[PDB]
């Protein structure tokens, strides 16, 4: 089946990236004809078992997998506030993904409302409404 071959390839790419994003806690991502499942301790589990930061890692791992699958490489990546809700766990995971993986990408444009992420970035600007108009401040 052509469909099966595609979902299979995407799953392989997603597995490698997710395993990297979770320090090997999860060995693979399984794509069922389309539902996703993760492997932990040799068993496929539903996504309902993932904690906050792991959900962010999985969603991004899958997007990155699709990117590689379709373009063959990643030059530019634009994350337009893909995960606006950010608690302690989610934030730490995102910062981890930024400094260990995203910094390997030629160019990444990350839009967020979280000031704490600035330390894991190469260049930073802050935008704010001043007297009714957007004002840009170069921070780095």
């Amino acid at each position: 089946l052509a469909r099966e071959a595609a979902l299979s390839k995407i799953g392989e790419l997603a597995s490698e990236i997710f395993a990297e994003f979770t320090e090997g806690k999860y060995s693979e991502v399984v794509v069922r004809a389309v539902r996703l499942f993760v492997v932990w301790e040799g068993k496929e589990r539903p996504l309902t078992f993932l904690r906050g930061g792991e959900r962010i890692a999985l969603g991004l791992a899958f997007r990155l997998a699709m990117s590689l699958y379709l373009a063959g490489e990643i030059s530019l990546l634009i994350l337009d506030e893909p995960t606006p809700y950010l608690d302690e766990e989610r934030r730490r995971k995102l910062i981890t993904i930024m400094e260990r993986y995203l910094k390997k990408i030629p160019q990444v444009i990350l839009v967020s409302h979280d000031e704490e992420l600035k330390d894991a970035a190469d260049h930073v600007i802050r935008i704010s409404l001043e007297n009714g108009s957007s004002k840009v401040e170069v921070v780095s």
């Binding site: 969603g59 530019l76 990546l77 506030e81 893909p82 930024m98 967020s112 992420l117 957007s134």
Partner: protein, 129 residues
């Protein structure tokens, strides 16, 4: 591809915004209604107009070693030009019209490739999980 710079004037909360993009991770911090969101919309408009998502938008980007520049102005009426850098000057890559530029972009960087492999939005994540 890589973005180099975008200038946005009279678009949403932007009166005269200029943003440079560099190598590595470019973080744009801002709160709701700050204009961070509309800035990305201006880029999408700059690259893929016409689409649904005096206003002036000027975008410079790099693709396959060639430096490109798209400039759009919405008066009524609208002006659209897409050029390439050659030595020290910019030259038209195609007829300075909305349709010609749109056709060129779909061949240079197809809209589906941009949304499926480059642009990550919350909706996609939600759909995955």
């Amino acid at each position: 591809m890589k973005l180099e710079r975008v200038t946005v004037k009279n678009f949403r909360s932007h009166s005269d915004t200029v943003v440079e993009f560099k190598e590595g991770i470019n973080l744009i911090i801002g709160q709701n209604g700050s204009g961070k969101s509309s800035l990305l919309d201006a880029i999408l408009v700059g690259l893929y107009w016409p689409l649904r998502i005096d206003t002036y938008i000027d975008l410079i980007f790099e693709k396959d070693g060639t430096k490109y520049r798209i400039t759009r102005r919405f008066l009524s009426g609208e002006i659209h030009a897409m050029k390439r850098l050659v030595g020290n000057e910019w030259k038209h890559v195609t007829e300075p019209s909305s349709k010609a530029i749109s056709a060129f972009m779909e061949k240079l960087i197809p809209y589906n490739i941009f949304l499926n492999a480059i642009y990550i939005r919350q909706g996609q994540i939600d759909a995955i999980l």
